[PDB]
Amino acid sequence: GSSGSSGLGNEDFNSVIQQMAQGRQIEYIDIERPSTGGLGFSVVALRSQNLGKVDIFVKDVQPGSVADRDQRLKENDQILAINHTPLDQNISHQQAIALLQQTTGSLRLIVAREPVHTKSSTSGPSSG
Known about the structure:
Elements: H1 13-21, E1 25-32, E2 42-47, E3 54-59, H2 66-70, E4 79-82, H3 93-102, E5 106-113
Antiparallel strand pairs: 1-5, 2-3, 4-5
Subcellular location: Cell junction, Tight junction; Apical cell membrane; Cytoplasm, Perinuclear region
Domain PDZ: 28-115
Protein name: InaD-like protein
């Protein structure tokens, strides 16, 4: 369905994000939009199950570009909102991409991450 209002109602920007994350730890990845460069990362569109919507995930995180050398954007990071705008059922996968290809100077991305649970994922820093 479609609706139009001035602001928010039952569900606010803080609620929508908290609902899409599902408790998952949310992180604000602030990226500095370069002048002679780009985000340095790609995104994938995958229709979710919750409801007519698309889940944008950060793929091909060029390990060395601003996204990294500058920010700490991780791969497979489901973007909940972009520049103060959630990609809920309201916004499709396309719109999400625009906000990026459009948003200049500063580009914020609120992604979620799954917590730890008797996982014990072996991870260590490698020098070379």
